[PDB]
Amino acid sequence: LHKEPATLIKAIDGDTVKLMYKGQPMTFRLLLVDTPETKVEKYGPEASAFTKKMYENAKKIEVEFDKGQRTDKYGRGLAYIYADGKMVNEALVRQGLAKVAYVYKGNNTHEQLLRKAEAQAKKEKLNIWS
């Protein structure tokens, strides 16, 4: 897998962000995470505020597609997003602001990594695991 640069256009909510990728605007859906939705579930506004902060204060945003299907049926890009080298997908799960989702069409490269972060958040009874 390789990381490619992108530019923040707009944070939408916990699991979705609009980025300029290779010249055009695109909506991305974070791989392997399910965050509470604001469109308003419990912790939904916290999860979206958390990612908004990460995206807006970053010097560099990068997107990493996995080896499976790269867009869902709604036309969203499916990827791991990094803010200053830190994976947002991972940070959400570790902070207990998202659960690890079921693998979608072969996109499982970092599933183990996220599974471990989630077990730890669970042990610490963080947010959603309260």
CATH no. of 1-130: 2.40.50.90
27 appears as a binding residue in the annotation: no
Alpha-carbon dihedral angle through residues 119, 13, 67, 106, given to the nearest 10 degrees = 60
CA–CA separation, 94 and 88 (whole Å): 10
Which are the catalytic amino acids? 29, 37, 76
Domains in the chain: boundaries = 1-130
Residue 36, token pair as written in the block: 């509470």
Distance CA(8)–CA(6), nearest Å, equals 7
| Determination technique used | X-ray
d(CA 65, CA 45): 26
Closest-CA residue to 8 (of 46, 53, 49): 53
Q: Å resolution of this model?
A: 2.1
The position carrying tokens 């009874």 is: 125
Q: Is 34 annotated as a binding residue?
A: yes
Q: How many angstroms separate the CA atoms of 6 and 23, rounded?
A: 9
Residue 15 annotated in ligand binding: yes
**Tokens 């939705």, residue?**
37
